[PDB]
Amino acid sequence: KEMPQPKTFGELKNLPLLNTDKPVQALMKIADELGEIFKFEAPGRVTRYLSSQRLIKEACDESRFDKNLSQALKFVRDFAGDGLFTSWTHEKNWKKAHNILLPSFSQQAMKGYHAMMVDIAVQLVQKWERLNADEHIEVPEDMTRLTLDTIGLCGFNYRFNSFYRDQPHPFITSMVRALDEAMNKLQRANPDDPAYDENKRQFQEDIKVMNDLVDKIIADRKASGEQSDDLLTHMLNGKDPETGEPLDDENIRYQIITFLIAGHETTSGLLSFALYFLVKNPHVLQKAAEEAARVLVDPVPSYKQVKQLKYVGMVLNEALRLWPTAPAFSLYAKEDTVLGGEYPLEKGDELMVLIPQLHRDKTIWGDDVEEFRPERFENPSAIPQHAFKPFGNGQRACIGQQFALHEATLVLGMMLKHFDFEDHTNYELDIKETLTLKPEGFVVKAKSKKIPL
Numbered sequence: 001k002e003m004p005q006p007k008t009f010g011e012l013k014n015l016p017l018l019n020t021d022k023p024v025q026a027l028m029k030i031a032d033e034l035g036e037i038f039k040f041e042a043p044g045r046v047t048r049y050l051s052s053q054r055l056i057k058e059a060c061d062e063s064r065f066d067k068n069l070s071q072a073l074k075f076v077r078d079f080a081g082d083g084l085f086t087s088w089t090h091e092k093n094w095k096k097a098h099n100i101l102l103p104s105f106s107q108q109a110m111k112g113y114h115a116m117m118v119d120i121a122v123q124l125v126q127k128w129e130r131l132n133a134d135e136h137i138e139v140p141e142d143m144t145r146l147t148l149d150t151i152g153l154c155g156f157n158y159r160f161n162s163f164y165r166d167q168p169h170p171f172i173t174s175m176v177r178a179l180d181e182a183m184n185k186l187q188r189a190n191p192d193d194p195a196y197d198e199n200k201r202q203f204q205e206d207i208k209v210m211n212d213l214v215d216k217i218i219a220d221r222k223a224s225g226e227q228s229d230d231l232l233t234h235m236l237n238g239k240d241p242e243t244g245e246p247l248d249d250e251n252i253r254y255q256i257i258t259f260l261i262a263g264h265e266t267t268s269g270l271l272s273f274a275l276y277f278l279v280k281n282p283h284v285l286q287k288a289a290e291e292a293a294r295v296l297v298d299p300v301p302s303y304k305q306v307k308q309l310k311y312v313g314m315v316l317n318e319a320l321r322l323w324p325t326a327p328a329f330s331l332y333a334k335e336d337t338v339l340g341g342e343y344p345l346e347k348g349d350e351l352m353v354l355i356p357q358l359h360r361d362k363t364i365w366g367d368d369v370e371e372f373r374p375e376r377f378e379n380p381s382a383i384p385q386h387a388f389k390p391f392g393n394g395q396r397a398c399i400g401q402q403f404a405l406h407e408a409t410l411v412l413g414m415m416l417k418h419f420d421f422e423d424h425t426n427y428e429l430d431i432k433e434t435l436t437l438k439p440e441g442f443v444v445k446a447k448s449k450k451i452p453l
C-alpha cells in the first residue's frame with residue numbers, strides 16, 4: 001500500500017501547509033481528501049496522520065506505540081520541563097510524578113475539590129446575574145476566568161481573582177506569550193534570521209518570569225508549614241510507592257506550570273463549545289435545562305447532585321466528539337511493525353492521531369456524524385474501544401479527565417439552572433488554535449430565571 005501525501009513545495013516538502021493560524025483544521029481537510037492515513041514530510045522529518053478507528057485502535061496498543069513529543073511539545077518543554085505533559089514515558093520523573101499525583105486526580109478526590117469549584121462557579125453566576133439589560137457575555141473570556149481560578153484554588157490555594165480584573169496576572173501574560181511563541185515556531189522555515197532575535201529575547205524573559213514566580217509559591221508554602229488539601233501539599237508530602245522518593249522542588253515547579261497551562265487552555269474550550277452547541281440546538285438546550293432544574297434543587301449544588309446530571313454529561317461528551325479541545329497526540333513505533341496489515345513502520349517512526357477525524361468515522365458513528373446528538377452517549381457500554389479518545393490513550397491519557405468533567409458538569413449545570421441563553425448575533429463558528437481549540441468571539445445574552453443562590 002502506497003500512502004497518500006498532500007501537495008508539496010519543492011525542497012520544503014509539506015512544511016508550508018502548516019503556515020496557517022488554523023493547522024489542525026487544515027489537516028482535517030487533508031484527511032477528508034486523502035482518507036484514513038497520509039504521509040507528511042518536512043525538511044529532516046516525516047510523520048503519518050491517522051483518522052480511522054481501524055488504524056487508531058492499533059496505534060493505541062501500548063505494547064507497540066508510546067507517546068512522542070511532537071515539535072510543538074518540544075518547544076513547550078522549554079518552559080513546562082519534565083512535567084507530566086512534556087516528559088517521555090522513559091524519564092524517571094514521568095512515572096514518579098504519575099504515581100504520586102494519580103490519587104490527587106481520582107473521582108474520589110473530586111469530593112475534596114467540590115467546595116472550591118462551587119466558590120468559583122458561584123462567582124461566575126453572580127457576575128452574569130449582575131449584568132444590565134442588553135449587555136452580553138464574552139463566553140471563552142469568562143470560561144477562562146473560571147477555569148484559571150479553579151486550578152489556582154484547587155492547585156495551590158491561590159486566588160487569581162480573574163472576575164475582579166480585565167488585565168491578566170503577570171504569570172499569565174508571560175505564559176500566553178510563551179505558548180504563542182512555541183506555536184509560532186512550528187511554521188518558521190528560517191529560525192536563525194536576526195528578524196526573530198526579539199522573539200528569542202522575549203521568550204527567555206517569559207521563561208524566567210514563570211520560573212521565578214512559581215519557585216516563590218513553593219518556597220512560601222515550605223516557609224508557612226500550611227497543609228491545605230491541594231496539589232502543592234500532595235507534591236511536598238507524597239512519596240512514589242515505586243522508588244520511595246518524593247518529587248524535587250524543580251520538578252514540582254514544572255508540574256505547577258503544567259497544571260496552570262492546562263487550567264487556562266482546556267476545560268474553558270469544552271465549556272465554550274458546549275454552550276455554542278446548546279444555543280445552536282434549542283431542543284437539546286431544553287433537555288439539559290430541564291435536567292438542571294429537576295436535579296439542582298438546592299441553592300449550592302452538592303457532589304452527588306453533579307453526579308446525577310447524566311444529560312449534562314452527555315452534552316459535554318458530544319461537544320468533545322465534534323471538537324475535542326486537545327485535538328491531536330503523537331506516537332512512535334517501539335519496534336518495527338506493520339500498521340493495519342498494509343503500512344510497514346521502522347522502530348522510531350512517528351504517527352499523529354487526528355482526534356476530530358476519529359470522532360467523524362462513519363463506520364463507527366453512522367452517517368449523521370456532523371449532527372449534535374448527546375443521545376449517542378446514553379449508554380457508555382455501546383461506544384467501542386478506542387472510538388472516542390478526547391483524553392488521549394492508556395498510561396499517558398489525561399490525568400485531569402475527572403477534574404475537567406466535574407468542573408464542566410457543575411458549571412454548565414448551574415448556568416442552565418440560572419439563565420435562559422440567546423445567540424443574539426447568530427454567531428458564525430470561528431475556531432482559534434493554540435495547543436487547544438476555542439470558539440473565538442463567541443458571545444451570548446443571558447436572561448436570569450431569578451432563582452436565588
Ligand code: HEM
Nearest residue numbers: 084085262266267270326329390391392396398399400404
Ligand atoms: C477538556 C479538558 C481536557 C482535555 C480535552 C484534555 C485532553 C488531554 C489529552 C488529549 C492528553 C494527552 C496528550 C498527549 O498524548 O500528548 C492530556 C494529557 C494531560 N492532561 Fe489533559 N485535558 C483536559 C483537561 C486537563 C486538566 C484540567 C488538567 C489538569 C488540571 C490536565 C492535565 C493533563 C496532564 C498533566 C496530562 C499529561 C498526562 C501524562 O502524560 O501523565 N488536562 N489531556
Ligand SMILES: O=C(O)[C@H](Cc1ccccc1)NC(=O)[C@@H]1CCCN1C(=O)OCc1ccccc1
Nearest residue numbers: 023024042070071072073186326327328329435
Ligand atoms: O508539532 C508537530 O510536530 C506537528 C506539526 C508538524 C510540524 C512540523 C513538521 C511536521 C508536523 N503538530 C501537529 O500536527 C498538531 C497540529 C498543530 C499542533 N499540533 C500538536 O500536536 O500540538 C501539541 C499538542 C496539543 C494538544 C495535545 C497534545 C499535543
Ligand SMILES: N[C@H]1CCCc2ccccc21
Nearest residue numbers: 085258261262266326435
Ligand atoms: N491537557 C493537556 C492537553 C492540552 C494541552 C495541555 C497543556 C498543558 C498541560 C496539559 C495539557
